[PDB]
Design a protein around this motif. Structure first.
Motif, PDB file in Angstrom:
ATOM      1  N   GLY A 120      54.719 -29.873  40.957  1.00 24.41           N
ATOM      2  CA  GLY A 120      55.858 -29.701  40.083  1.00 24.41           C
ATOM      3  C   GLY A 120      55.429 -29.902  38.655  1.00 24.41           C
ATOM      4  N   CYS A 121      56.225 -30.662  37.910  1.00 23.52           N
ATOM      5  CA  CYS A 121      55.959 -30.906  36.500  1.00 23.52           C
ATOM      6  C   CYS A 121      54.956 -32.025  36.248  1.00 23.52           C
ATOM      7  CB  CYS A 121      57.254 -31.206  35.734  1.00 23.52           C
ATOM      8  SG  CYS A 121      58.582 -29.983  35.877  1.00 23.52           S
ATOM      9  N   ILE A 122      54.482 -32.699  37.260  1.00 25.19           N
ATOM     10  CA  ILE A 122      53.556 -33.794  37.030  1.00 25.19           C
ATOM     11  C   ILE A 122      52.116 -33.324  37.166  1.00 25.19           C
ATOM     12  CG2 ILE A 122      55.268 -35.559  37.628  1.00 25.19           C
ATOM     13  CD1 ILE A 122      53.175 -36.191  39.966  1.00 25.19           C
ATOM     14  N   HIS A 123      51.293 -33.939  36.343  1.00 19.94           N
ATOM     15  CA  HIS A 123      49.887 -33.618  36.181  1.00 19.94           C
ATOM     16  C   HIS A 123      49.123 -34.833  36.667  1.00 19.94           C
ATOM     17  CE1 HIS A 123      52.262 -31.120  33.482  1.00 19.94           C
ATOM     18  NE2 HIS A 123      51.301 -30.223  33.614  1.00 19.94           N
ATOM     19  N   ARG A 141      44.877 -37.207  32.864  1.00 21.14           N
ATOM     20  CA  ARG A 141      45.500 -36.291  33.800  1.00 21.14           C
ATOM     21  C   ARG A 141      44.958 -34.888  33.556  1.00 21.14           C
ATOM     22  NH1 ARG A 141      51.521 -38.848  32.575  1.00 21.14           N
ATOM     23  NH2 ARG A 141      51.166 -40.688  33.895  1.00 21.14           N
ATOM     24  N   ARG A 142      44.605 -34.166  34.623  1.00 25.78           N
ATOM     25  CA  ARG A 142      43.994 -32.852  34.443  1.00 25.78           C
ATOM     26  C   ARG A 142      44.424 -31.920  35.560  1.00 25.78           C
ATOM     27  NH1 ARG A 142      39.285 -33.345  31.086  1.00 25.78           N
ATOM     28  NH2 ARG A 142      38.610 -35.525  30.906  1.00 25.78           N
ATOM     29  N   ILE A 143      44.969 -30.766  35.177  1.00 28.64           N
ATOM     30  CA  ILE A 143      45.190 -29.645  36.081  1.00 28.64           C
ATOM     31  C   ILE A 143      44.403 -28.462  35.548  1.00 28.64           C
ATOM     32  CG2 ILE A 143      47.495 -30.605  36.360  1.00 28.64           C
ATOM     33  CD1 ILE A 143      48.633 -27.886  35.497  1.00 28.64           C
ATOM     34  N   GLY A 144      44.037 -27.543  36.432  1.00 28.00           N
ATOM     35  CA  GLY A 144      43.162 -26.469  35.999  1.00 28.00           C
ATOM     36  C   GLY A 144      41.815 -26.998  35.586  1.00 28.00           C
ATOM     37  N   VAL A 155      35.944 -31.501  34.221  1.00 27.24           N
ATOM     38  CA  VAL A 155      35.702 -30.821  32.957  1.00 27.24           C
ATOM     39  C   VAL A 155      36.950 -30.052  32.549  1.00 27.24           C
ATOM     40  CG1 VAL A 155      34.278 -29.055  31.870  1.00 27.24           C
ATOM     41  CG2 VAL A 155      33.272 -30.630  33.509  1.00 27.24           C
ATOM     42  N   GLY A 156      37.454 -30.327  31.345  1.00 29.40           N
ATOM     43  CA  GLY A 156      38.543 -29.535  30.799  1.00 29.40           C
ATOM     44  C   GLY A 156      39.840 -29.727  31.552  1.00 29.40           C
ATOM     45  N   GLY A 157      40.667 -28.690  31.505  1.00 26.78           N
ATOM     46  CA  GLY A 157      41.971 -28.697  32.130  1.00 26.78           C
ATOM     47  C   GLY A 157      43.121 -28.817  31.152  1.00 26.78           C
ATOM     48  N   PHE A 158      44.264 -29.234  31.695  1.00 24.17           N
ATOM     49  CA  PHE A 158      45.514 -29.362  30.961  1.00 24.17           C
ATOM     50  C   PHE A 158      46.174 -30.647  31.424  1.00 24.17           C
ATOM     51  CE2 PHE A 158      49.013 -28.140  28.470  1.00 24.17           C
ATOM     52  CZ  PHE A 158      50.191 -28.275  29.181  1.00 24.17           C
ATOM     53  N   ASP A 159      46.575 -31.486  30.471  1.00 27.11           N
ATOM     54  CA  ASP A 159      47.081 -32.817  30.793  1.00 27.11           C
ATOM     55  C   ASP A 159      48.595 -32.906  30.797  1.00 27.11           C
ATOM     56  OD1 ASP A 159      47.813 -32.825  28.128  1.00 27.11           O
ATOM     57  OD2 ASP A 159      46.579 -34.549  27.581  1.00 27.11           O
ATOM     58  N   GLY A 160      49.293 -31.785  30.594  1.00 23.85           N
ATOM     59  CA  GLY A 160      50.737 -31.743  30.486  1.00 23.85           C
ATOM     60  C   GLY A 160      51.210 -31.436  29.082  1.00 23.85           C
ATOM     61  N   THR A 161      50.403 -31.759  28.087  1.00 24.43           N
ATOM     62  CA  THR A 161      50.716 -31.480  26.696  1.00 24.43           C
ATOM     63  C   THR A 161      49.653 -30.646  26.012  1.00 24.43           C
ATOM     64  OG1 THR A 161      51.817 -33.633  26.672  1.00 24.43           O
ATOM     65  CG2 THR A 161      51.456 -32.533  24.551  1.00 24.43           C
ATOM     66  N   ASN A 162      48.382 -30.953  26.240  1.00 25.71           N
ATOM     67  CA  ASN A 162      47.298 -30.242  25.585  1.00 25.71           C
ATOM     68  C   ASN A 162      46.298 -29.737  26.610  1.00 25.71           C
ATOM     69  OD1 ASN A 162      47.823 -30.543  22.673  1.00 25.71           O
ATOM     70  ND2 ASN A 162      47.622 -32.725  23.108  1.00 25.71           N
ATOM     71  N   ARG A 213      39.001 -25.665  27.376  1.00 26.42           N
ATOM     72  CA  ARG A 213      39.007 -24.761  28.524  1.00 26.42           C
ATOM     73  C   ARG A 213      39.883 -25.326  29.629  1.00 26.42           C
ATOM     74  NH1 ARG A 213      34.332 -21.354  28.111  1.00 26.42           N
ATOM     75  NH2 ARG A 213      32.877 -22.254  26.596  1.00 26.42           N
ATOM     76  N   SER A 214      40.931 -24.583  29.958  1.00 27.98           N
ATOM     77  CA  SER A 214      41.711 -24.769  31.168  1.00 27.98           C
ATOM     78  C   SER A 214      41.483 -23.560  32.063  1.00 27.98           C
ATOM     79  CB  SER A 214      43.181 -24.893  30.796  1.00 27.98           C
ATOM     80  OG  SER A 214      43.944 -25.047  31.956  1.00 27.98           O
ATOM     81  N   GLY A 215      41.294 -23.806  33.353  1.00 26.30           N
ATOM     82  CA  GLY A 215      41.033 -22.713  34.268  1.00 26.30           C
ATOM     83  C   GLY A 215      39.682 -22.055  34.102  1.00 26.30           C
TER      84      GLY A 215
END
Ligand SMILES: COc1ccc(S(=O)(=O)NCc2cccc([C@@H](NC(=O)c3cccc4c3-c3ccccc3C4=O)C(=O)O)c2)cc1
Length: 291
Positions: free
Chosen positions: A111-114, A137-140, A153-160, A185-187
């Protein structure tokens, strides 16, 4: 060393996909194998003991969107998938790495949580257990293993979206920051080749990237290498016989079917094949050809 294939599982094109297809670099052939039981994009693949594992992801379908906590195991000798123990939490846009026969599942979204959480799977016990969470926190997130250390490495933390990276030391159950990449880099596709962690492509918040950089663990520096022919985010990546293969992704216009191959000795990328259809968000790993 002979008879190993590059397997691509899942992905996204118009909806999440169930495909399992395997490419043979020796002859250019593709085989379509047993579909995943549940379509998933944003998953990761890995291999332990000759079995292929599909970890996490999300089923984006016309009838709903469900983040996955699943671990499924594909046996090439039987061409069959079997469920394994599920993770503690759904993890879409996950990263995974293998250390000493154990699968680490890193980050991802629910959902909305990272997530910053990380968990480790023991195939011999068919059990997952949580380990220390990342510092961010890291997605992607791109994950790779070098010298029995796990890198995120990298990703998206919910804000940046992130240029930062960190390393997990299993004997201390501890994460530490490493030098950040030069590019957000995300993804991206993240893998290990020789003594370096490579980060290829991704999304910097503005554009999909063709740039590729590598972290030398001895010098702790990131250095750009030759860029890919295509900008790509949400690509699959693996290493086979000393070369990096990147599969699919999205270039800002098209879901790519391109597969490119990096030769570190010449510092060149070449187009080697095309997938049977364009897609992003695949899981990729290498193992024995099926029977
Ligand atoms: C509902 O549709 C889906 C569902 C799942 C997937 S997926 O499984 O591939 N996961 C996507 C993903 C993973 C990791 C990182 C990113 C980064 N985003 C971009 O590159 C990006 C930015 C703007 C527009 C677009 C994209 C982008 C990327 C891929 C395909 C199409 C596009 C765009 O149309 C980021 O958010 O950092 C995305 C793809 C589509």
């Amino acid at each position: 060393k002979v008879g190993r294939l590059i397997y691509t599982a899942g992905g996204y094109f118009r909806q999440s996909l169930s495909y399992l297809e395997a490419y043979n670099p020796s002859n250019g052939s593709w085989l379509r194998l047993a579909d995943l039981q549940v379509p998933r994009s944003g998953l990761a693949g890995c291999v332990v003991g000759g079995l292929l594992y599909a970890v996490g992801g999300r089923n984006n379908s016309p009838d709903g969107n469900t983040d996955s906590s699943a671990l499924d195991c594909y046996n090439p000798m039987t061409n069959q998938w079997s469920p394994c123990a599920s993770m503690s939490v759904p993890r879409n846009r996950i990263g995974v790495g293998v250390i000493d026969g154990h699968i680490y599942a890193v980050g991802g979204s629910h959902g909305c949580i990272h997530h910053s959480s990380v968990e480790r799977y023991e195939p011999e016990r068919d059990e997952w257990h949580l380990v220390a969470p990342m510092l961010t926190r890291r997605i992607g997130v791109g994950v790779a293993v070098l010298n029995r250390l796990l890198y995120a490495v990298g990703g998206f933390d919910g804000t940046n979206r992130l240029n930062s990276a960190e390393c997990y030391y299993p004997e201390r159950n501890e994460w530490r920051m490493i030098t950040p990449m030069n590019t957000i880099r995300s993804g991206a596709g993240v893998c290990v080749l020789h003594n370096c962690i490579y980060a290829a492509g991704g999304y910097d918040g503005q554009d999909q990237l063709n740039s590729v950089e590598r972290y030398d663990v001895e010098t702790e520096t990131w250095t750009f290498v030759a860029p890919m022919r295509h900008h790509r985010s949400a690509l699959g990546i693996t290493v086979h016989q000393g070369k990096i293969y990147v599969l699919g992704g999205y270039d800002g216009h098209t879901f790519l079917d391109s597969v490119e191959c990096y030769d570190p000795d010449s510092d060149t990328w070449s187009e080697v094949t095309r997938m049977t259809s364009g897609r992003s968000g695949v899981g990729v790993a290498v193992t024995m050809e099926p029977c």
